[PDB]
Ligand binder design. Structure first.
Ligand SMILES: *[C@@H]1O[C@H](CO)[C@@H](O[C@@H]2O[C@H](CO)[C@@H](O)[C@H](O)[C@H]2NC(C)=O)[C@H](O)[C@H]1NC(C)=O
Ligand SMILES: *[C@@H]1O[C@H](CO)[C@@H](O[C@@H]2O[C@H](CO)[C@@H](O)[C@H](O)[C@H]2NC(C)=O)[C@H](O)[C@H]1NC(C)=O
Ligand SMILES: *[C@@H]1O[C@H](CO)[C@@H](O[C@@H]2O[C@H](CO)[C@@H](O)[C@H](O)[C@H]2NC(C)=O)[C@H](O)[C@H]1NC(C)=O
Ligand SMILES: *[C@@H]1O[C@H](CO)[C@@H](O[C@@H]2O[C@H](CO)[C@@H](O)[C@H](O)[C@H]2NC(C)=O)[C@H](O)[C@H]1NC(C)=O
Ligand SMILES: *[C@@H]1O[C@H](CO)[C@@H](O[C@@H]2O[C@H](CO)[C@@H](O)[C@H](O)[C@H]2NC(C)=O)[C@H](O)[C@H]1NC(C)=O
Ligand SMILES: *[C@@H]1O[C@H](CO)[C@@H](O[C@@H]2O[C@H](CO)[C@@H](O)[C@H](O)[C@H]2NC(C)=O)[C@H](O)[C@H]1NC(C)=O
Ligand SMILES: *[C@@H]1O[C@H](CO)[C@@H](O[C@@H]2O[C@H](CO)[C@@H](O)[C@H](O)[C@H]2NC(C)=O)[C@H](O)[C@H]1NC(C)=O
Ligand SMILES: *[C@@H]1O[C@H](CO)[C@@H](O[C@@H]2O[C@H](CO)[C@@H](O)[C@H](O)[C@H]2NC(C)=O)[C@H](O)[C@H]1NC(C)=O
Ligand SMILES: *[C@@H]1O[C@H](CO)[C@@H](O[C@@H]2O[C@H](CO)[C@@H](O)[C@H](O)[C@H]2NC(C)=O)[C@H](O)[C@H]1NC(C)=O
Ligand SMILES: *[C@@H]1O[C@H](CO)[C@@H](O)[C@H](O)[C@H]1NC(C)=O
Ligand SMILES: *[C@@H]1O[C@H](CO)[C@@H](O)[C@H](O)[C@H]1NC(C)=O
Ligand SMILES: *[C@@H]1O[C@H](CO)[C@@H](O)[C@H](O)[C@H]1NC(C)=O
Ligand SMILES: *[C@@H]1O[C@H](CO)[C@@H](O)[C@H](O)[C@H]1NC(C)=O
Ligand SMILES: *[C@@H]1O[C@H](CO)[C@@H](O)[C@H](O)[C@H]1NC(C)=O
Ligand SMILES: *[C@@H]1O[C@H](CO)[C@@H](O)[C@H](O)[C@H]1NC(C)=O
Ligand SMILES: *[C@@H]1O[C@H](CO)[C@@H](O)[C@H](O)[C@H]1NC(C)=O
Ligand SMILES: [Zn+2]
Ligand SMILES: [Zn+2]
Ligand SMILES: [Zn+2]
Ligand SMILES: [Zn+2]
Ligand SMILES: [Zn+2]
Lengths: 56, 188, 205, 56, 205, 188, 205, 188, 56
């Protein structure tokens, strides 16, 4: 939806300090969420559920 | 011309055609246009006059018609459209039929055309009337080529003439004419 | 005049304008483009279908333009209009007159500032429109509830990490549980008499 | 306060995805806050303060 | 207009007004101060440089003031104006007219409510201007993305603390890994048969 | 006076000067001033009158000039500025030169000054005209001291007088005068 | 005309309207309801207390209605007005004229779109007014400070969980504390000199 | 009718009483009601006419009172209120007393009632005046039942009559009448 | 920046409950961030990096 238009219009937004700060915070938050979901074990849980006894 | 000014932003222009504004209209709208300078024209209904300012006096008050009431124009020309256009032009230029000096007009029977002349000279007692006429002409005509110098005689004449097909078609002039004309009855 | 037919434009093409831009015509009476739209809408409406001309045109604009003509300052001929258009989204600003001075169209360097500001204002108007559409659709109370819930949850995580002590202990002593202690360091059961010893808070075992 | 009036207008608000998402996030955040306050020991601390040596 | 000279004011000073307050004159057709600014700007422009006088003032407002004078209710005689000025910021309100009754200026206590409301409106206008300036530069989608990223990261921390179980165990039974278990509690390798034993989730060791 | 009303918000005032406004001017704006009460003055061009409402009748219809057209005021004063000021004052009050009763004016040849008298009495056939005159005078003059009682005859006289320098410099009166004056020409 | 008395309304009651709806009359000059409010306010104000009639009504709107009935399109005869009302909060839209066509009131189905859009706009205006009232009291800088403080606190919790290494150990080698190591795992004391060995960044003990 | 359109949102209506507005008014506002069709009425002050359009010519130009100035109506009716209502009705229609053809009226001395007649025919020289009359009558009366066809002669008669209490009370007509009345001195 | 002007207008803002709540939440968040950065070891890591073998 609005994500495609936002993707097209990003070059105009990256001229204010606040917009760059928001982009950096969003990227860092997503990366950290991925890494600590991996550390928690959710990915391992789904991988094991996919291999529900079908391998060892 | 269209050109880009931002990342996705483009400067663009639109123009309005005016032949499709006048030729494609329900009513018949007055036409006011100028060739070069000091060559004013006017067109409404069938009548098409050529407003001309010059020092000489074609019509003198002693020999010709005196128009102080609009009904006195019945002695001006056979064509009623010419009378209509003259009356409404004089209303548009701000002429008051009760508080302004009368203007002359050639006798209808006298076979030298239809001419009406207005004393627009900015001299002495005629000063306020001349200034009001100047105001009216600036309203009706955009970039009005004034030639009535202060003090010197300046009497306008309106003769019928062929409408110049090579004349620019203005519309602000028509808008001002309709605004000042008050309760005008445009032929359909 | 939301759309415009070919006979109303110098170029023999059909150009139609957006609703948001032309919605300013009902509110603004200091724009020549709106007067031209009204006049041409009347002309096209009443060609065969169905002081109207002077109620369609703002007399104030004609008077101001005539005064500007008499002052020899740039004025509008009501002929050519320029506007700033966002190509991707299609949103555009309300067209403004290409002012004329000395019976000639001005050059694009005289009102460069005008159209630069118009483009910036158009971008700001689109972003503000997104914000206004959001604000008229989502209640503020729900936003506040979500924000305070998130803050409370984050504080709860912090308390989870730090841990809150649950009972009372004493330095160099084992757990009195399941026997509790008072502020002095001993309850009334008699197993732990009130010795007034200093107590050290400790978390759950 | 505004919560009482907001209570009546909820059925009108649950027509957009964002409002449902905000309600869900608020409820999940409140539930998680309660569960990890219980895990932290705040409720146990309050109960102990209530039972300040009055029982065993 | 935007600024006033010494001869324009009773006291010979260089008092000079702001931008938004005088920009409100273009939109507002009911204001004595804006009409007086138009008149004085016209006079200062036409003194040596380059119905104007009556088309420079709002006839409706002047008629309203005349009717109010006839009604013997407070009216404005277009001489003295008051405004509320934020001293530090310099941002002020549009100068309203000091109304007159009994051929004498009204005392401050009569429009105390008026100027209290004017000050409150000025504070609110400054805060709202800051919000609108923010909304005209920062896209709403980026704010939403940041908020949802923060919510996702907080949920991720919560899942990190709690810990999601990774495999299947049995009450009082060793770790089956690297041999996985099905819903019944044993895969098809034959080491762990389908004994239909209940399974208890445990996290990674 | 300036005083603080919040932490930083301060009540402040700006006052416009009228002497400067009238001093610096592309034209000669008319002046309408009311010294004390029941003493009305008017100033335009070089002419300056003193409007006075009295029960006496200095000018009688059968001895002085009957004015039904503005051009009939040629037999009223040698100075054209006085005629101009009188005409535009009568226009500003609301005197329709065709539908309103004529007003008297002293013969120019007689060496008894320039006085023109307008019948503003609220009695009989003059009721509507006197009401219109009262409307005009309330428009032109704020805090207008009406003295023309109902029934009783009331006639105004406008005669030249020295402009009182001690009289204030109101400008709302000039604004109403210009609004009601229609197409008035102000000398430079 | 904030309130209306019984003699002004068919089925005489004391129907009184809100503040925002009647405040929209000051700005708008294209509303028949506002014109009739001005007319009745004039009538009741000057009945015994204290071109007023034509300065009270908008001549442009009356002329527009006259042209519309001459065009035989729906128009307004300044009699019946319909408005959309939120029953609980009492907020309502500014009443719109129940248009007439061919000497008969238009059926509800003709302006169904009109009143649906009016209801939607009323709800949107309520929510937007709530947002604006919030923005006029709470500064934007304080909101930004709170948001950035929360983001900083959440990142701080993340760093608390992960743990930042403090000293510099060596593969297999034990804790040299207290003895600091350089980029090569060396020191001036010579206890653990520059042996050029891989270093282990292990967290605080 | 009141009905729900949302959850808490209800459609509601407000209706204005017109008899309250007319009766409660301090001034005496004119009334204009169109009962049935081609049966126009008017009432202002005490006089109450019945505007009628018909091809007959009750009053002839050479045998009755010719009105070219409002003051010439003093030979029409003894009642001043009837004269006042006629004058202001003609002003509201759009009758210029200097640029429009004169209209007839019955002699006051003759005891055949108060009747004044206006040539509203769109024939010959009477083209613009009848169109202006039609414009004015459409303004004054809502859904004006025009009966004066093009070319065919059509003459208006106004006679006193009892005001029909059954005819609807309209205020838009009064608003148009007041707007077109220019400076009308309404009775208190 | 805007902070120096915002500090001058603080007494005007602390008349609404929400503004006081925001100030309190901001201060508590900053304090908690400082304390759990100290617990994390970032300050200790910086101190060690400064004392890169120069002392013991
Ligand atoms: C147009 O008006 C001017 C000015 O009123 C007339 O010129 C003056 O007329 C008087 C009276 O005949 C003469 O005594 C003057 O010598 C004229 N000269 C000027 C320049 O003032 C002029 O005659 C009028 N023209 C017509 C055709 O009537
Ligand atoms: C602004 O520019 C855009 C891009 O040229 C125009 O949108 C295009 O309009 C044409 C003509 O109707 C369509 O064929 C294209 O598909 C449109 N493109 C997009 C992306 O919408 C738009 O009309 C312009 N706006 C104006 C001229 O007012
Ligand atoms: C308004 O004025 C402009 C110039 O100020 C006119 O522009 C000219 O238009 C003609 C006709 O298309 C072109 O041939 C000229 O080259 C244009 N530019 C000039 C003369 O500089 C425009 O036509 C005018 N519009 C009206 C309606 O009169
Ligand atoms: C509001 O008050 C401020 C502060 O007094 C005014 O700003 C002053 O403007 C004058 C103009 O001559 C300068 O000399 C001062 O230095 C300014 N002071 C500061 C602190 O900047 C401002 O002009 C006032 N606004 C008005 C009068 O509209
Ligand atoms: C001013 O107007 C009044 C109008 O009432 C004139 O007075 C009346 O004139 C008529 C003339 O026929 C007499 O019948 C009345 O008796 C007069 N007086 C009244 C009715 O009060 C008055 O004469 C006029 N003055 C001048 C100088 O013309
Ligand atoms: C508007 O009314 C006020 C109050 O009557 C006038 O203020 C007076 O102005 C003069 C000249 O500056 C001062 O000497 C007086 O002291 C002021 N006050 C009073 C009570 O007279 C003001 O002049 C009026 N404005 C106009 C344009 O007439
Ligand atoms: C919208 O509807 C509400 C609810 O019916 C109206 O509020 C009522 O107003 C009347 C007087 O008009 C009071 O007697 C009732 O007690 C009110 N009810 C409530 C629940 O407050 C409101 O007036 C309506 N809005 C209008 C008519 O504009
Ligand atoms: C009303 O006006 C019409 C049109 O002007 C008059 O009728 C015309 O009168 C002239 C002069 O006698 C004739 O030449 C025309 O043939 C007449 N036209 C028609 C259609 O009759 C008519 O006489 C006027 N009526 C009154 C009462 O004066
Ligand atoms: C506006 O038009 C409507 C519809 O014609 C008129 O409504 C009528 O009002 C009368 C008086 O209350 C009722 O008896 C009728 O039943 C209504 N309906 C119809 C269809 O006639 C209304 O009177 C008009 N307003 C004015 C001021 O004339
Ligand atoms: C001149 O005009 C009059 C009317 O103004 C007319 O009577 C006369 O016939 C015309 N010319 C002649 C031939 O005398
Ligand atoms: C004005 O326009 C003319 C052509 O219309 C051009 O030649 C000229 O240079 C311009 N400037 C002046 C001062 O005439
Ligand atoms: C006006 O713009 C045109 C654009 O091509 C440029 O050539 C021209 O030099 C500019 N102005 C003038 C008259 O020098
Ligand atoms: C109004 O002003 C006059 C001026 O003479 C004064 O006497 C009077 O007290 C004031 N107040 C009232 C209520 O008339
Ligand atoms: C008196 O005035 C008239 C104009 O109304 C004028 O004709 C006459 O000459 C003047 N009187 C004398 C004695 O000259
Ligand atoms: C208007 O309504 C009348 C009611 O009698 C009807 O006869 C007529 O046909 C209608 N006109 C239309 C629908 O154009
Ligand atoms: C008829 O009217 C005139 C005025 O128009 C009047 O002089 C005359 O007396 C009236 N007729 C008769 C017979 O009295
Ligand atoms: Zn313990
Ligand atoms: Zn395991
Ligand atoms: Zn297996
Ligand atoms: Zn270590
Ligand atoms: Zn060492």
């Amino acid at each position: 939806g609005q994500f495609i238009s936002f993707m097209q219009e990003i070059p105009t937004f990256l001229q204010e300090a606040l917009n760059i700060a928001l982009v950096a915070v969003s990227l860092i938050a997503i990366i950290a969420g991925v890494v600590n979901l991996y550390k928690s074990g959710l990915f391992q849980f789904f991988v094991f559920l996919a291999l529900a006894g079908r391998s060892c | 011309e269209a050109f880009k000014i931002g990342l996705h932003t483009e400067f663009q222009t639109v123009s309005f055609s005016m032949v499709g504004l006048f030729s494609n209209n329900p009513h018949d709208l007055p036409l006011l246009c100028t060739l070069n300078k000091s060559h004013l024209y006017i067109k409404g209904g069938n009548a098409s006059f050529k407003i001309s300012f010059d020092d000489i006096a074609v019509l003198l008050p002693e020999y010709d018609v005196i128009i102080q009431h609009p009904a006195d124009m019945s002695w001006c020309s056979k064509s009623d459209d010419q009378i209509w256009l003259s009356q409404w032009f004089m209303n548009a230029v701000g002429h008051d039929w009760y508080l302004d000096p009368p203007f002359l007009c050639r006798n209808r029977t006298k076979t030298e055309g239809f001419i009406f002349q207005v004393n627009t000279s900015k001299t002495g007692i005629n000063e306020n009337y001349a200034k009001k006429f100047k105001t009216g002409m600036h309203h009706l005509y955009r970039e009005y080529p004034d030639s009535c110098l202060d003090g010197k005689l300046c009497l306008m004449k309106a003769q019928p003439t062929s409408w110049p097909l090579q004349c620019p078609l203005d519309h602000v002039n028509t808008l001002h004419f309709l605004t000042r004309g008050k309760n005008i009855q445009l032929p359909r | 005049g939301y759309c415009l037919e070919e006979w109303m434009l110098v170029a023999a093409k059909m150009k139609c304008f957006g609703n948001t831009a032309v919605a300013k015509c009902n509110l603004n009476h200091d724009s020549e483009f709106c007067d031209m739209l009204r006049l041409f809408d009347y002309n096209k409406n009443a060609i065969k279908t169905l002081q109207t001309i002077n109620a369609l045109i703002s007399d104030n604009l004609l008077m101001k333009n005539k005064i500007r003509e008499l002052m020899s300052v740039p004025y509008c001929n009501y002929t050519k209009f320029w506007y700033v258009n966002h190509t991707l989204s299609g949103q555009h600003s309300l067209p403004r007159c290409w002012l004329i001075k000395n019976n000639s169209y001005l050059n694009i360097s005289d009102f460069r500032n005008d159209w630069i500001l118009e483009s910036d204002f158009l971008i700001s108007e689109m972003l503000s429109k997104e914000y206004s559409d959001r604000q008229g659709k989502t209640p503020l109370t729900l936003v506040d509830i979500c924000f305070w819930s998130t803050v409370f949850f984050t504080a709860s995580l912090f308390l989870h990490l730090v841990g809150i002590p649950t009972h009372r202990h004493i330095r160099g002593e084992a757990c009195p549980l399941p026997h509790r202690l008072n502020s002095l360091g001993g309850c009334r059961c008699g197993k732990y008499p009130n010795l007034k010893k200093p107590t050290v808070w400790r978390r759950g075992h």
